């Protein structure tokens, strides 16, 4: 779930990703 590009950290998809 952790993005290589830091500008992703607060994206809809990363947040959804953490909602395993």
């Amino acid at each position: 779930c952790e993005p290589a590009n830091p500008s992703e950290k607060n994206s809809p998809s990363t947040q959804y990703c953490y909602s395993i």
Partner: antibody
Amino acid sequence: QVQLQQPGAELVKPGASVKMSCKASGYTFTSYNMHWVKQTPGRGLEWIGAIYPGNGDTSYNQKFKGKATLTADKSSSTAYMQLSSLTSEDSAVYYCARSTYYGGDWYFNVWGAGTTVTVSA
Amino acid sequence: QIVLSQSPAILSASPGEKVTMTCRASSSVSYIHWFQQKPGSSPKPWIYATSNLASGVPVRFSGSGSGTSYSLTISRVEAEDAATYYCQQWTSNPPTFGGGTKLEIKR
């Protein structure tokens, strides 16, 4: 002229630390992720980490997590990578590269000329 | 980190020949990237998103592939093509590069 400027070379004493610069121009520095890549003849091109200048947010490769520290300065539009307690294995070429377009997928479309580091006493 | 294996290590090509180089990944990736690197210089974006050509990259170059198997191919080898070509992936963090296939001109 979208460009990334890095010093040509740095000589570091084994044990010391070195902070490398990577000045950017021709685009707004705070809307793109800056990446750093390591290169040696033996271990190839290795991704170290990245930083987003508009946030300060950083991302690391586990391999260089305790070796590199990434920072960015808004006013001078410069990215920095500090290498701590350098050993012979750190002698290599270091690149900074901007990434863009998450769409299809990311793209390293702007690279720096690379700063060659030699660690020797 | 996904492992990208390139082949051949060295590819000898006569001027005018049509050659191809492959790239295989330890596990599936959505797109593969190619960079050209002449010695002493920084690697140059050559192909992005599997099949697209970067700015100033001649039509002789092309790329395709899927899942774990990709390839870069030159339709007409020219002198200025000598260099190492590198494979690259963004599907997994940390993003990784391949070992590179060195192309040399058999003139």
